Amino acid sequence: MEALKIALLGGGTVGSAFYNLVLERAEELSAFGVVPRFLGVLVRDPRKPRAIPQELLRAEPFDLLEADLVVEAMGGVEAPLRLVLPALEAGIPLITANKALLAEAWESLRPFAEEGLIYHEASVMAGTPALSFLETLRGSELLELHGILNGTTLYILQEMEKGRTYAEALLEAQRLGYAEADPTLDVEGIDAAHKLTLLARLLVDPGFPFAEVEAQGIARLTPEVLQKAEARGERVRLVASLFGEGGRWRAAVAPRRLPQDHPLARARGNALWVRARPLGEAFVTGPGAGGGATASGLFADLLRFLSGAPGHLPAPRARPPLEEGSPWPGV
Amino acid sequence: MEALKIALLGGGTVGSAFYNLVLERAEELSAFGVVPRFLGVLVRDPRKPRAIPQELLRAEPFDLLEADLVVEAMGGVEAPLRLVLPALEAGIPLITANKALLAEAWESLRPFAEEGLIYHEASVMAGTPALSFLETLRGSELLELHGILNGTTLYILQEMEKGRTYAEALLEAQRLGYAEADPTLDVEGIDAAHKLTLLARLLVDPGFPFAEVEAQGIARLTPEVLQKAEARGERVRLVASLFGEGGRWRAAVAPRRLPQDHPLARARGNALWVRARPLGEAFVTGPGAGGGATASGLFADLLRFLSGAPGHLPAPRARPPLEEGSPWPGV
Amino acid sequence: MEALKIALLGGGTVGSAFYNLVLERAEELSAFGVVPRFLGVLVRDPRKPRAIPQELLRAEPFDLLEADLVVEAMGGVEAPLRLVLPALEAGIPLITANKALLAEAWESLRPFAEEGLIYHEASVMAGTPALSFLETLRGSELLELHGILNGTTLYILQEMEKGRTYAEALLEAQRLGYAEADPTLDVEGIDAAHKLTLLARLLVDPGFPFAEVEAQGIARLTPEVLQKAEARGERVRLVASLFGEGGRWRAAVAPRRLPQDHPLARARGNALWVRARPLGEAFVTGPGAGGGATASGLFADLLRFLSGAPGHLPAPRARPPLEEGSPWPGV
Amino acid sequence: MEALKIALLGGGTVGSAFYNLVLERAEELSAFGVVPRFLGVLVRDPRKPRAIPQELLRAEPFDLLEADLVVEAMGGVEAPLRLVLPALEAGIPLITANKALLAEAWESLRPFAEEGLIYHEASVMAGTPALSFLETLRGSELLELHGILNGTTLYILQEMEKGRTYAEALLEAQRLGYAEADPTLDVEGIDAAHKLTLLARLLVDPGFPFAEVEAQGIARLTPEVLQKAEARGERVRLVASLFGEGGRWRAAVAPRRLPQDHPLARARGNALWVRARPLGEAFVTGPGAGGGATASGLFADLLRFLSGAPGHLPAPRARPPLEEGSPWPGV
Ligand SMILES: NC(=O)C1=CN([C@@H]2O[C@H](COP(=O)(O)OP(=O)(O)OC[C@H]3O[C@@H](n4cnc5c(N)ncnc54)[C@H](OP(=O)(O)O)[C@@H]3O)[C@@H](O)[C@H]2O)C=CC1
Ligand SMILES: NC(=O)C1=CN([C@@H]2O[C@H](COP(=O)(O)OP(=O)(O)OC[C@H]3O[C@@H](n4cnc5c(N)ncnc54)[C@H](OP(=O)(O)O)[C@@H]3O)[C@@H](O)[C@H]2O)C=CC1
Ligand SMILES: NC(=O)C1=CN([C@@H]2O[C@H](COP(=O)(O)OP(=O)(O)OC[C@H]3O[C@@H](n4cnc5c(N)ncnc54)[C@H](OP(=O)(O)O)[C@@H]3O)[C@@H](O)[C@H]2O)C=CC1
Ligand SMILES: NC(=O)C1=CN([C@@H]2O[C@H](COP(=O)(O)OP(=O)(O)OC[C@H]3O[C@@H](n4cnc5c(N)ncnc54)[C@H](OP(=O)(O)O)[C@@H]3O)[C@@H](O)[C@H]2O)C=CC1
Ligand SMILES: N[C@@H](CCO)C(=O)O
Ligand SMILES: N[C@@H](CCO)C(=O)O
Ligand SMILES: N[C@@H](CCO)C(=O)O
Ligand SMILES: N[C@@H](CCO)C(=O)O
Ligand code: NA
Ligand code: NA
Ligand code: NA
Ligand code: NA
Missing domain, CATH: 3.40.50.720 (NAD(P)-binding Rossmann-like Domain)
Incomplete structure (x- = not known):
């Protein structure tokens, strides 16, 4: 002992x-x-x-x-x-x-x-x-990774779909303790980009620079935009993506239109979804x-x-x- | 009434x-x-x-x-x-x-x-x-502007001059209520850049973009670097500058070596120093x-x-x- | 101004x-x-x-x-x-x-x-x-003064009459912010005795010593004692008294049996009841x-x-x- | 288990x-x-x-x-x-x-x-x-007991020895979590008296009454009184004493003048000093x-x-x- x-x-x-x-x-x-x-x-x-x-x-x-x-x-x-x-x-x-x-x-x-x-x-x-x-x-080789890596903006977008406003939802998110000290890191995709970078360094490139992540947050989104999505059978989420482009790994964070039945659109909390060779398609949520x-x-x-x-x-x-x-x- | x-x-x-x-x-x-x-x-x-x-x-x-x-x-x-x-x-x-x-x-x-x-x-x-x-x-034409616009990082370099560490100094600035909720904004020069941008827009270009400011913080500075500066007759400060380069206005934030007698170096609070024609040289601090x-x-x-x-x-x-x-x- | x-x-x-x-x-x-x-x-x-x-x-x-x-x-x-x-x-x-x-x-x-x-x-x-x-x-001369001068013990005795226990009631009283930092000063009559002394010095004797106040608190009281009182048409209260005895002012704090319709038994909060010459009988409550x-x-x-x-x-x-x-x- | x-x-x-x-x-x-x-x-x-x-x-x-x-x-x-x-x-x-x-x-x-x-x-x-x-x-018969049993008032006299005021010292002791909720218990000697009583009952009389302890605090002491004591080769401390007088045990708490080399005077924490027959002289501090x-x-x-x-x-x-x-x- x-x-x-x-x-x-x-x-x-x-x-x-x-x-x-x-x-x-x-x-x-x-x-x-x-x-x-x-x-x-x-x-x-x-x-x-x-x-x-x-x-x-x-x-x-x-x-x-x-x-x-x-x-x-x-x-x-x-x-x-x-x-x-x-x-x-x-x-x-x-x-x-x-x-x-x-x-x-x-x-x-x-x-x-x-x-x-x-x-x-x-x-x-x-x-x-x-x-x-x-x-x-790592048993397999990545083909594409997409995650919903920021709880504050997930919470905000879920609340806005229900018609609540950005500012209402943010306030609640801060009360639940989800937000960073400054919420800007959440709502402009930066926190997602920090997380995505760490995932990239584990799986695909140990030197992956945070500065190479292209990040855009949820500032153009409104309950109206989200309701229009729903009417198309879509959900909008902030998604963190890792994928190959001309022979290199590329990392981005941005709002995306997802099919409403996609695991990422449905998931209960944060979620990481991967397609890899030869395993196939795996995800985790919580x-x-x-x-x-x-x-x-x-x-x-x-x-x-x-x-x-x-x-x-x-x-x-x-x-x-x-x-x-x-x-x-x-x- | x-x-x-x-x-x-x-x-x-x-x-x-x-x-x-x-x-x-x-x-x-x-x-x-x-x-x-x-x-x-x-x-x-x-x-x-x-x-x-x-x-x-x-x-x-x-x-x-x-x-x-x-x-x-x-x-x-x-x-x-x-x-x-x-x-x-x-x-x-x-x-x-x-x-x-x-x-x-x-x-x-x-x-x-x-x-x-x-x-x-x-x-x-x-x-x-x-x-x-x-x-x-505005009664004169700006030649150059240089300011110490971030209270938290002045406080930190002032405390470090007296041998205190970064972490101690930072902790104390947070306690005094000086730091942004995210202290990174203070210490990587971003808050100074935000302020610099507003000064540019007021004075010389009403569309000046925040993204054009080039900003670097105090992360390379230690009580040793600053004490070596004192012995060369210099003070190191984070300075926000607006100045002409190639016929365009350039805006930068970075640690600079100041002569120790310069108004900017001797400022105990924040400070803005301007040269303009025909006024000359004017300064405010508090x-x-x-x-x-x-x-x-x-x-x-x-x-x-x-x-x-x-x-x-x-x-x-x-x-x-x-x-x-x-x-x-x-x- | x-x-x-x-x-x-x-x-x-x-x-x-x-x-x-x-x-x-x-x-x-x-x-x-x-x-x-x-x-x-x-x-x-x-x-x-x-x-x-x-x-x-x-x-x-x-x-x-x-x-x-x-x-x-x-x-x-x-x-x-x-x-x-x-x-x-x-x-x-x-x-x-x-x-x-x-x-x-x-x-x-x-x-x-x-x-x-x-x-x-x-x-x-x-x-x-x-x-x-x-x-x-002071227009008149005091004949007798009786007060209910401690809110914590009033609250406790009111709660105990309703069958709640001493310890339950005290806890609530502390939450409402009524109690002294140490509740002993409340429950042993000392706070009442401090107050009584100040009243005596205003009205009857400017040298009145705090040490001369005879003080006893509510420690022998239980919901049972109070219910037995009620059945006799009485209420028990902690009462602070000032009265003459062999040519001197005497001050005491103690639990007392009061007629249930007496102003002191009924009063909404703290209460001071006086009989004085020639005014007659006056009281204040709040x-x-x-x-x-x-x-x-x-x-x-x-x-x-x-x-x-x-x-x-x-x-x-x-x-x-x-x-x-x-x-x-x-x- | x-x-x-x-x-x-x-x-x-x-x-x-x-x-x-x-x-x-x-x-x-x-x-x-x-x-x-x-x-x-x-x-x-x-x-x-x-x-x-x-x-x-x-x-x-x-x-x-x-x-x-x-x-x-x-x-x-x-x-x-x-x-x-x-x-x-x-x-x-x-x-x-x-x-x-x-x-x-x-x-x-x-x-x-x-x-x-x-x-x-x-x-x-x-x-x-x-x-x-x-x-x-208890293996010996008590001759006399003297202790420094109140942490808050030791702290206060130690701080006052170095020129600090009573109020400052007190404030700091409250912050350290040493003071009774009511600090008066500490500074008028009552808390020492409470403790003194329990020592008497353990050692020499299982019914010793708290009311028999004679207790006086530190309210007459200033940084001046203590600094004059230092120059006479003395330290002033609040001391809780149990000793024989007229064939009865007497218990008292009061400021006492100690030789500065006495164990009680040199104690940095609280201290209990006993003389008993046949052990002799024993002391504990912490x-x-x-x-x-x-x-x-x-x-x-x-x-x-x-x-x-x-x-x-x-x-x-x-x-x-x-x-x-x-x-x-x-x-
Ligand atoms: N909230 C969340 O949901 C999650 C947060 N995180 C991460 O965990 C970390 C902490 O987050 P969280 O606990 O919510 O933040 P909190 O502000 O709740 O906690 C920060 C803690 O650090 C202390 N502290 C902060 N800065 C200094 C300093 N300069 N000097 C001395 N002490 C300091 C604070 O002191 P004091 O309390 O006195 O102010 C506080 O105790 C962050 O990196 C965040 O990104 C990770 C996963 C989830
Ligand atoms: N501190 C300083 O030295 C200076 C600060 N500023 C600026 O002033 C502004 C406020 O700063 P400061 O007061 O230090 O910050 P504080 O965090 O101390 O205050 C923020 C206030 O806004 C409320 N609040 C925060 N976020 C939200 C939200 N999303 N919705 C609703 N209410 C919110 C908080 O509620 P609650 O209290 O319940 O947490 C709190 O009362 C900032 O822009 C800062 O940059 C400017 C100059 C100096
Ligand atoms: N509560 C009530 O209903 C009533 C109370 N009173 C009386 O008013 C007075 C205050 O009562 P209350 O406000 O309830 O008590 P609280 O403990 O709520 O307030 C005491 C205040 O005094 C500060 N303080 C206490 N001791 C020290 C010290 N040694 N050094 C520096 N600062 C100190 C405290 O600091 P901090 O907050 O940091 O601990 C706190 O701000 C008492 O005399 C009480 O008898 C009178 C009528 C009603
Ligand atoms: N501090 C010290 O150095 C020492 C203290 N002691 C003794 O230990 C005991 C506790 O002291 P300390 O912890 O400092 O005191 P604190 O006031 O810090 O703690 C008192 C605790 O008891 C709870 N409480 C207080 N009054 C009541 C009540 N009437 N009913 C129910 N809960 C109550 C409080 O709830 P809440 O937190 O919600 O307020 C709090 O958690 C005291 O007898 C003190 O003399 C002994 C040796 C050392
Ligand atoms: N602000 C962060 C905390 C979790 O790291 C988020 O919303 O996901
Ligand atoms: N954190 C900021 C607040 C004042 O704008 C500073 O240090 O200057
Ligand atoms: N503890 C006190 C506060 C009012 O002075 C009381 O209960 O009356
Ligand atoms: N207030 C007490 C607590 C320890 O019993 C003291 O100062 O000794
Ligand atoms: Na994890
Ligand atoms: Na200003
Ligand atoms: Na009053
Ligand atoms: Na002990």
Whole structure:
């Protein structure tokens, strides 16, 4: 039996849910041979209302180098980056839900990802299997990937189909805790693009640049546009696509007209749909946002780590696209 | 005594400071023969402790068309846009501190800015005179403009100069209420770019596009880089520049090496430095972030309105630069 | 027109309600010739959730000597005492709701009360008239005073009569914000005894010591005891009494059996009942606790101050009791 | 593996720390063949952010009779009393940190303390050994006992020694979670008196009355008085004393002048100093307040229980003192 010393970065909706999940499931952890011991939780207001004991809160950065694991769910890029890099350099693993960090600081983080030190299941579709799903998909070669990777805009478009307005729906989405701190990252496709980039690096090209993703959000959409779609037997969704074009991988995020009976149009939550050779057509769906959904993901990764498995590795080498089949109907 | 009927969008750091400033200054408003009456205040969560009366809180959008003024401080782009457009179409002015909205939705908002319906002093350097400063500078032809327009990143480089880390500094700026909800906007230079764009449009080209601003943040800077700069007699700052290159106006944001005696280097708050012909060299500095600082700007604009003056107008035409220029050296 | 510079000590349930009441009614204040300007609000957590703008919060003591008025609703004794004494010494008035302070630090505070610098209507029965009521009663000489001066125990006894348990009722009372920080002061009669002492000093003896009050709370009471009372046509209440005994004023707090139709048994809230010569029998009733009720009181006192009236003066000299008539049925 | 069924009364600083400590230490409990199961957690406000699961929160009293243990950390006297008595009558132990309850309701609780049903290590000096320390000291006959038993007022005098004010110091102690809800209990010596009483009953007289303790606080002390003490080679501390006078045990709390080299003067945490025959001179010091410190005590007692040991017993008889004594000089 040994102590698992955990440094937690961020004590918000995700951080808190993870804290409490780890202690609630400490009996599970003991079957893995460990007892969880939080060293501290980095936050901004150590004295306010929060679902973590006050004395564990740290309003200032603390030394991470005696941790066994760093868990991060701070949001942003450069600040978490500078906090996690010394831990990574010392060979301490990172479990993160922070898709922006990974997408936008890959030059610094890729070498540690390659050594199996970064676990990030929660960074795409929360604790819905996404990275694991593509790890198994690597048995086959991708032909096309399409996902609904942002819960806030899904929620908004579902509410707008029901005639509610953009602004009403966004407000609710923020209350449910789905939105990023700034909702612009959700509604302009950027959060989807961060996620798509991580999927591409796992499956098809370990150097895939976030900047190459062409992203457009849901700003031209209205309840009227959606009702007109429905009348054509279609649904409009924000879709994140990965596909070959003239010999290269291309990544896009955009609203798309889908047949109403397509798995992506129907799915209950976030969804990733793939066609691959030789497996065929596979998809996964579940909640893509929220405290508890994300904590599930982070805790999945902690069990992954504890069982002796490495983190999520980039593709070992860029793979050749098989199909030039750039699909699509935009809106 | 007539009602001045205000719809307030947002009840956060800025909206609350504003609401309370209005109440405290109600005497001053009686000097124009009005009494301020808030029709409602749009917020996400009517449950939080808030220095605004429960009964005025709205969790859902409310009709704006009986207002004499819409004051907006909700954040984002598309949602505030869709909420203010109907009021603007009806000839109701908007008072806003929302630089992202103005910068990113100018195709929709420009026509109403041109009619005098948009007041936005608080959108750049908060209640420190910036737009008014430039309105006066229109008496001359611009040669070059350089500003320190992001309060959060000034604060960070000032704190880093004294040896503090990035992460600490950032954390403290968030606590002071200076950071955008997404701090990445501050630290990658995007918020400065938003502000830069609005200065360009006011002064030299009413269609200047936000996408034309070239912007790079402070992510390569450490307490070491800045302390080496001090020993060369320099200060490093993030500077927003508008200057002539090849007969076109160029707009850039980047860390620059300043002589340490330069007004921009010696500024403790945000700062705007202009050279124009025939005035010469003029400079303004003051706080560029914070609830009260921002509320001052919004209230300055409410007084501007009530006095009979129109909003902030874009430049009446585009014109090329008079002289070829250049910013300071990068880092 | 002039500025009324206010230092507020405490930003809790009372402090916040008062802050917001002062700004909401600033138009009333302008008819008195003033505009309210808070210098700062002393609290413990300046960053947490609260119904006062964050920037006005002060987590540490601040200089009060440029205030025109100090308002205190911090709770406790020695800490507020040490904060207000320099202001009192400088001739700056105090408006307080803090009955413990006044009862237990009267040696230090009496000389300032005598000079008319202390306004404390809110310290007994909140903004229900109590001190003003006894100021008018001074036309007559007291024969007996009985009050129901603690809202928490009233609420508990009313709930217990309805069969709810002590512990259920207390919990609700704490949620409604009626209880002191420690409920022991409520349930053992001490808070009632603090209040009774202040009443005695106004009306009958300016040196009346808090230590001479004989106080016993509601700890022997149960729903059964109360139901047995009801069956006898009685109600049990915690009653605060002032009456002459062998030539001296005596003060007690204790549960008493009252006829069910007595004003004290019926009253809607806190109640003060007096028999006096020659006026006869007078009473007053209303809410004795709560944020808004207390803020009413403090704001009444601010208007009192602004109109040129002095604070609540102690009796100029101990008055001779007329009746030896020690009344009573205990329980 | 059997359920250890715990009813927790209180979910605040202490109850939360305890709840989370139990979860984190669940492995350790499997070594006694139990798994901890909380039947419910009594709280005032189920809405606050709290590191305890929503579904276990109870806003109203719940049946305790299926519990193996009641752990209480709700504060006050009468309400916890009425809630724990039925459990105690049913032979369910109580683990408590509530010194006021024990001190003030001993007529009801003594019989159950005598049967081994009450564990209260955390009631004096938190999880620092105090009751266990005295249980060992029963091997000798007490000559005299002197302790620094109030964490808040030590903290205040330590901070005042360094020039800080009372009010500042107090504010900081409240923030650290050291102060009773009513800080007056701390600063007028009453909390030390509560603790003193429990030490007397454990050691020398199982009926010692709380009302017999003579108690005076720190209200006459300033940074000036303490700095003058330093120059005489002395430290002033609030000291709780039990000593023989005229053949009876006397218990007092008061500021005392200590030689600066005395163990009591050099203690950074709370401290208990005893002279007994034939042991000699023994001393214990450690943290006497705080959530985690207190939770350690409660959990120590839960382990004591689970090992088969009974609670803390009162002294098996009263006995007179062996020697006439005397505390240090007052201030
Ligand atoms: N919400 C969701 O549905 C999901 C979010 N994510 C990701 O998880 C991460 C966190 O999201 P979420 O929990 O919702 O965000 P929250 O704002 O709820 O949490 C952020 C936490 O980080 C602390 N913090 C943030 N910045 C700093 C800083 N500069 N210095 C010190 N402490 C800081 C905050 O302190 P404080 O509380 O004091 O302000 C807070 O405790 C983000 O990367 C987001 O993209 C992933 C999946 C789902
Ligand atoms: N802070 C500063 O220094 C400055 C900020 N600004 C700008 O002013 C604006 C507001 O900033 P600040 O007050 O700091 O932001 P805050 O997040 O503190 O306030 C945002 C406010 O808007 C409400 N809100 C947020 N999103 C929505 C939505 N989609 N629908 C309805 N209500 C919403 C919130 O409700 P709730 O409180 O329930 O969460 C909150 O009251 C921003 O554009 C910012 O860039 C400008 C100058 C200075
Ligand atoms: N509740 C009621 O019904 C009534 C109460 N009163 C009296 O009014 C007073 C306040 O009561 P209430 O508002 O309910 O109490 P609250 O705890 O709600 O408010 C106390 C306020 O004082 C601040 N504070 C307290 N102690 C300190 C300290 N040592 N240093 C710095 N700041 C401090 C608190 O800060 P923070 O919020 O950060 O903790 C808080 O803002 C008390 O005297 C009470 O007896 C009178 C009539 C009615
Ligand atoms: N803090 C310390 O250093 C120490 C404290 N103690 C003692 O431990 C006990 C608890 O202290 P602490 O946790 O600091 O106090 P807190 O006020 O922080 O916690 C009190 C808890 O009990 C709940 N509560 C309070 N009153 C009632 C009531 N009448 N009915 C039901 N629930 C109630 C509250 O609910 P909610 O959270 O909804 O408000 C809260 O969860 C006290 O007896 C204190 O003297 C002992 C040693 C150290
Ligand atoms: N804002 C994100 C959170 C999940 O990563 C979303 O809506 O999907
Ligand atoms: N985050 C912004 C707000 C002020 O516009 C800044 O730092 O300047
Ligand atoms: N606890 C007090 C507040 C009013 O002063 C009461 O219950 O009356
Ligand atoms: N307020 C108490 C709590 C610890 O029992 C103290 O300061 O000691
Ligand atoms: Na996932
Ligand atoms: Na400005
Ligand atoms: Na009153
Ligand atoms: Na102890």
